[PDB]
């Protein structure tokens, strides 16, 4: 399957005193591997997965230099956009950026991203051709013009198709024991009476990676979509994910209902019955 490297940056202005709070996190697929937090003491990019500790001291110095430079760029952008939106100095605002790349099953570049939000709304995004920009509003047209005139898409494309893919491949190999392992969900059903005449069946999917999964209920082999309660996929805290789906049914009729679990770690979907 494909794999992804992504960085997620959040900078929030502090109008009462001081410079913006900046947090950067890096992921390979659904695994966080580095962080930086401007409020922390180290002022360093820090490891958050064991396989990134394979990198030498030069890696940590370089990523710290680059992440601190990114923090300054977000501080500048918060100031600039406050002006573009004619906002006062009294309010807190947020600039978010995400960028990164995917490789295919063929181990080659598949796609790149580089996009921004202001106050939680799309602002400007590099299009899929990595050669042009999408501006969400008229403020962002200013940035789009500036970036077209500066021809900055070329250097972004160079990073996204080149350097980004090269380092993603390195990380995948270094981290292969986890990054290239799928953890199929451990599945089971629980049964709870809610009265003498009805019961809840809850289908659990536990300890799975990556996070993408589908859980669905059927009754007599046809979907039972409207009567399903489904919680959002949630982190276990140990790097794996959890989900459940439940249906209330007449007690004595449990055997009509099946839970269907689809996940990349399962060569065929699983069917569970009480």
């Amino acid at each position: 399957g494909s794999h992804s490297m992504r960085y997620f940056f959040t900078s929030v202005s502090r109008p009462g005193r001081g410079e913006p709070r900046f947090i950067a996190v890096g992921y390979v697929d659904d695994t966080q591997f580095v962080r930086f937090d401007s409020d922390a003491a180290s002022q360093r990019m820090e490891p958050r997965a064991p396989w990134i500790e394979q990198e030498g001291p030069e890696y940590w110095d370089g990523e710290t230099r680059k992440v601190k430079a990114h923090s300054q760029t977000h501080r500048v952008d918060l100031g600039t956009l406050r002006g573009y939106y004619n906002q006062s100095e009294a309010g807190s605002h947020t600039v978010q950026r995400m960028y990164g790349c995917d490789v295919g099953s063929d181990w080659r570049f598949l796609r790149g991203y580089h996009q921004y939000a202001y106050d939680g709304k799309d602002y400007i995004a590099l299009k899929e051709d990595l050669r042009s920009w999408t501006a969400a509003d008229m403020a962002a047209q200013t940035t789009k013009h500036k970036w077209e005139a500066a021809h900055v898409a070329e250097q972004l494309r160079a990073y996204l198709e080149g350097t980004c893919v090269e380092w993603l491949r390195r990380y995948l190999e270094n981290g292969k024991e986890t990054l290239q392992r799928t953890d199929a969900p451990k599945t089971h059903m629980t049964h709870h009476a809610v009265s003498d005449h009805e019961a809840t069946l809850r289908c659990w999917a536990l300890s799975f990676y990556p996070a993408e999964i589908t859980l669905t209920w059927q009754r007599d082999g046809e979907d039972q979509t409207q009567d399903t309660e489904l919680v959002e996929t949630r982190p276990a805290g140990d790097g794996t994910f959890q989900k459940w789906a439940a249906v209330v049914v007449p007690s004595g009729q449990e055997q009509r209902y099946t839970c269907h679990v689809q996940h990349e770690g399962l060569p065929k979907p699983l069917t569970l019955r009480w």
Partner: peptide
């Protein structure tokens, strides 16, 4: 591995 900031002719280019 992070990218460098947008730079042209020795000078960084922000929004």
């Amino acid at each position: 591995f992070l990218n460098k900031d947008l730079e042209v002719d020795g000078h960084f280019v922000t929004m």
